[PDB]
Design a protein around this ligand. Structure first.
Ligand code: HEM
Ligand code: HEM
Lengths: 123, 141, 140
């Protein structure tokens, strides 16, 4: 799985979550504590979005290597199961955006499932 | 400024169809004679050219007037007097401009620019508007 | 609802694609089939091999549909009248398949155009593609 070996840890995570807030504005009501999310420039430049991005990226990294997060999102936070697929697809676009031509159609097919199996694990 | 020009409430859904007119097709091209796509999508093919007693006036139907900022039209490297004749509201957003063209003129450049709200300004330094047929006025009609 | 800001971003981004519309549209389909085998149900009598002639040809037809949609974004339902009847009344395609293709289109544009694919344009394209999906999947 060399695919994930060339990923940027400190910036790609915030890219995916940042786009989720911009592309799907209604996800911002779950992140009221982070403060300013009015403009896309403000949302992408928000350090809490970047800092939280490193955690969610690390969550995928642990998922790629191999449960507890399932109980947090559904019970504590009440995140709709469809919202996992949206961030599911936003991250895929972000990977395609950074790597570009290297992000091969057969590679995406593999990621769509790593993502799909992730959405199901939380559900 | 098209963003500022479409403010005038008087121009909101004003008449601009009464006139002896002709349908004239055209192509919108960039510096390398390639289809200038943003303008191709925005401006209407064909442009309605209206006849007067002095000079024929070409009317252009530009969409997304809320985003269109600068829109200068030159004939033989000389700025033509552009004026808004009508404008459609928020959802439709079509702006209608008119300008006079001399007899025999088939080509004229368009120096233009777009801006979404107070964001970044996208410049289009050269956009050639080539008509399919030279514009000739007819005072008899 | 597509705002003037959204309408502008879609025109600009699709304008930057330009002559590579059929090439990107052909790629977008190829991604949908491999990533989502469930979409192959609607194409039983089609050569869905790697680098197919029909898939490359069909991508152009889809790309031309999007070009027609972007060109007539102010009045999409009338612009895609005939194409709506096919996907809605005749073929009866499930709306879920359009979201898969819409995702595959966004991934294609993201891969080829990194400079133009800004978070704002991402939002506008996904919103535009969701609107074209609604027009094609709905019965008039
Ligand atoms: C790709 C799937 C997702 C993964 C892997 C993921 C992972 C995580 C992780 C690891 C945390 C921090 C856990 C901790 O340290 O206590 C977290 C927090 C959180 N997540 Fe997610 N998440 C995902 C999707 C979502 C979605 C779709 C939403 C809703 C739009 C969401 C909303 C939240 C919220 C509100 C928090 C709490 C942050 C805070 O304390 O302010 N997550 N997530
Ligand atoms: C981006 C959205 C889409 C656009 C713009 C689009 C456009 C088109 C166009 C222009 C045609 C050619 C119609 C003709 O001239 O006969 C066509 C045919 C067709 N489309 Fe789509 N389409 C879209 C999404 C889909 C989806 C999601 C499916 C189902 C997975 C689908 C299934 C088909 C089928 C089965 C045909 C006819 C194939 C045949 O010749 O037997 N399309 N589409």
């Amino acid at each position: 799985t060399a695919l994930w070996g060339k990923v940027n840890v400190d910036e790609v995570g915030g890219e995916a979550l940042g786009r989720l807030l911009v592309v799907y504005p209604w996800t911002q009501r779950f992140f009221e504590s982070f403060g300013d999310l009015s403009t896309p420039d403000a949302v992408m430049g928000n350090p809490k979005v970047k800092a939280h991005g490193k955690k969610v990226l690390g969550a995928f990294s642990d998922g790629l290597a191999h449960a507890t997060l399932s109980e947090l999102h559904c019970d504590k936070l009440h995140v709709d199961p469809e919202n996992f697929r949206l961030l599911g697809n936003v991250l895929v676009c972000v990977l395609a955006h950074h790597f570009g031509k290297e992000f091969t159609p057969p590679v995406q097919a593999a990621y769509q499932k790593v993502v799909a199996g992730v959405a199901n694990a939380l559900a | 400024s098209l963003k500022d020009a479409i403010k005038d409430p008087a121009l909101e859904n004003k008449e601009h169809d009464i006139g002896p007119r002709e349908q004239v097709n055209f192509q919108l091209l960039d510096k390398n004679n390639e289809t200038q796509y943003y303008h191709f999508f925005s401006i209407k093919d064909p442009a309605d050219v209206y006849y007067t007693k002095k000079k024929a006036e070409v009317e252009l139907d530009i969409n997304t007037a809320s985003t269109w900022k600068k829109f200068e039209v030159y004939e033989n490297n000389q700025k033509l007097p552009v004026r808004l004749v009508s404008y459609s509201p928020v959802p439709e957003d079509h702006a209608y401009i008119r300008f006079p063209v001399s007899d025999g003129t088939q080509e004229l450049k368009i120096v233009s620019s777009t801006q979404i709200d107070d964001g970044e300004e996208t410049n289009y330094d050269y956009t050639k508007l080539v008509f399919a047929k030279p514009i000739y006025n007819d005072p008899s009609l | 609802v597509l705002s003037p800001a959204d309408k502008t971003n879609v025109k600009a981004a699709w304008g930057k694609v330009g002559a590579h519309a059929g090439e990107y549209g052909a790629e977008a389909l190829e991604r949908m089939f491999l990533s989502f085998p469930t979409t192959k149900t609607y194409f039983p009598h089609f050569d869905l091999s790697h680098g197919s002639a029909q898939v490359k040809g069909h991508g152009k037809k889809v790309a031309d549909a999007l070009t027609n949609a972007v060109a007539h974004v102010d009045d999409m339902p009338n612009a895609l009248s005939a194409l709506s009847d096919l996907h809605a009344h005749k073929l009866r395609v499930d709306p879920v398949n359009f979201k898969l293709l819409s995702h595959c289109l966004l991934v294609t544009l993201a891969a080829h155009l990194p400079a133009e694919f800004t978070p704002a344009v991402h939002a506008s394209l996904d919103k535009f593609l969701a609107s074209v999906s609604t027009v094609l999947t709905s019965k008039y």
